[PDB]
Amino acid sequence: PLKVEKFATANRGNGLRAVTPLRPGELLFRSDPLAYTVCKGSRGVVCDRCLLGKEKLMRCSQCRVAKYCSAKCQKKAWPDHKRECKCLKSCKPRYPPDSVRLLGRVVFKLMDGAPSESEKLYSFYDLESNINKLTEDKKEGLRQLVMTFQHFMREEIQDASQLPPAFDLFEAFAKVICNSFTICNAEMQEVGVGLYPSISLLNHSCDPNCSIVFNGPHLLLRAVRDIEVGEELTICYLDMLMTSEERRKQLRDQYCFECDCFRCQTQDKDADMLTGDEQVWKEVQESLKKIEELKAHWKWEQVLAMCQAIISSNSERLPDINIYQLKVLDCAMDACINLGLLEEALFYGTRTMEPYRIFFPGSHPVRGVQVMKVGKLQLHQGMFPQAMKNLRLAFDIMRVTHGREHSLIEDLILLLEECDANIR
Ligand SMILES: N[C@H]1CC[C@H](S(=O)(=O)N2[C@@H]3CC[C@H]2C[C@@H](NC(=O)c2cc(C4CC4)on2)C3)CC1
Ligand SMILES: C[S@@+](CC[C@H](N)C(=O)[O-])C[C@H]1O[C@@H](n2cnc3c(N)ncnc32)[C@H](O)[C@@H]1O
Ligand SMILES: [Zn+2]
Ligand SMILES: [Zn+2]
Ligand SMILES: [Zn+2]
């Protein structure tokens, strides 16, 4: 039976609230996407279907754009790929914005597929569009997306009979911008984008009582605090390493709302996030645009070189609790992990631990993963007692944020045994 229900809130549209008391770690809902796709930078790096990396992928011949880890995935993806197959091939050699490819798959699922389990509580038809709050600048962008879609899909969709009844593309893209989820892999690297309309009922908080976590394209919604009957369920839509000014900008620009939460009212943690010389972190913030782009395209050598020039600069340096320094350390760590520079990865990862404890309070999946990464690095360098402490700490977080339904927990259970067997 459902532990959650749809309801009309006072001033934030529809929401989700608890029907029964909920405990930390309790599974509230699970869902495959209505539609999803690989994100721009991970295209040809991860499998289109399962969103896992592999040394070399098998590309679809029949369009030769979609890439797969296995014949299993390539064949199982064919139903939701066949029509975009015809389109991507016409397109060739142009690649569309992620939102266009995503909406393509939405339209095909709605036209050709059975009614989706992802739409149990709330459907794509029901999603918030915020059309009456859109600026003229944003509307212009949405008009370009509509024309991009029309061009991209001109092989498969020529008239209104091939869209759902009274389907409006402008409105559809408006729904996509404020309801799309960035799908992250087990390592918290961005790999996809998808729509999960039942999960779209959840409103935002900068200090939420629930969290989502991805296992491939599959999404698990879990409570991360005690929640009373009737209490609204919230998730944090945003990266935790953001100031209240930065959160304000994005929640306005993307989500068309003004956040009234305590953290936003008091600028909670902003001062600590911006410690160090302002001239220096301004330069690093600017440098991170390139670093993050390079990371998004899995260019670890270049990511590392840029991060090293900051972390071990011959000029002024920043404290590790500075959010821009902290992002640089994290990017450097993941680069070192993927270049097999494991000692250097551990130096960076270790340095992120205390800042992550502060900036990811309570039970947050991103901290759980970070601690697991540091524990895993220590385990494999034979630092068996420090590793056990971190892997147990990672488990205490991840038992709440991931749970037994997530396959990463099974991996973590094995590392507890493996590390436990070497010392204890
Ligand atoms: N380097 C960091 C970047 C951010 C991620 S994250 O896990 O913190 N991240 C996820 C969830 C929150 C934040 C930003 C993204 N958020 C969403 O995609 C999203 C969208 C929604 C609602 C439909 C609008 O709720 N969450 C992806 C960890 C690694
Ligand atoms: C993913 S939806 C959430 C469900 C939405 N309330 C609905 O009725 O469908 C995102 C939209 O909900 C609204 N929203 C989410 N969190 C909010 C908050 N803390 N305050 C005000 N509005 C919020 C905004 O309109 C936002 O663009
Ligand atoms: Zn696969
Ligand atoms: Zn194809
Ligand atoms: Zn807030």
Numbering used by the authors: 3 to 426
From the manuscript:
Within the protein lysine methyltransferase (PKMT) family of enzymes, one branch contains five enzymes that share two highly conserved, functional domains: the catalytic SET domain and the MYND domain; these five enzymes are known as SMYD1, SMYD2, SMYD3, SMYD4 and SMYD5. Among the SMYD enzymes, SMYD2 and SMYD3 have been implicated as targets for a variety of cancer indications. In the current study we exemplify pharmacophore series for SMYD2 and SMYD3 that show low nanomolar potency against their targets and significant selectivity over all other enzymes tested with favorable physicochemical properties and pharmacological tractability. S2 Table Crystallographic data collection and refinement statistics for SMYD2 and SMYD3 crystal structures.
Structure-activity relationship studies of SMYD3 inhibitors led to the isoxazole sulfonamide series exemplified by EPZ028862, another molecule displaying similarly potency against SMYD3 in biochemical and cellular assays with physicochemical properties suitable for in vivo studies. In addition, EPZ028862 was tested against a panel of 15 methyltransferase enzymes to check the selectivity of the compound for SMYD3. For all enzymes tested, including the closely related enzyme SMYD2, no inhibition was seen up to 10 μM. EPZ028862 inhibition is best described as noncompetitive versus MEKK2 (Eq 6) and mixed-type inhibition versus SAM (Eq 5). Kinetic constants kon (6.1 ± 1.1 x 105 M-1s-1) and koff, (2.1 ± 0.57 x 10−4 s-1) were based on fitted values from seven replicate measurements (mean ± standard deviation). Therefore, in order to provide support that EPZ028862 binds endogenous SMYD3 rather than only the overexpressed protein, a cellular thermal shift assay (CETSA) was performed that reported a 1.4 μM EC50 for SMYD3 binding and verified target engagement of EPZ028862 for endogenous SMYD3. SMYD3 has also been shown to regulate MAPK pathways by methylating MAP3K2. Instead, cell activity of SMYD3 was determined using a previously documented engineered system in which both SMYD3 and MAP3K2 were cotransfected into 293T cells and inhibition of Lys260 methylation of MAP3K2 was measured. Treatment of NSCLC and other lung cancer cell lines with and without KRAS mutations at concentrations as high as 25 µM had no impact on proliferation. We subsequently extended these studies to a broad panel of 240 cancer cell lines (Eurofins Panlabs Oncopanel) across a variety of indications; again, no proliferative IC50 was observed for this compound in any of the cancer cell lines at concentrations as high as 25 µM.
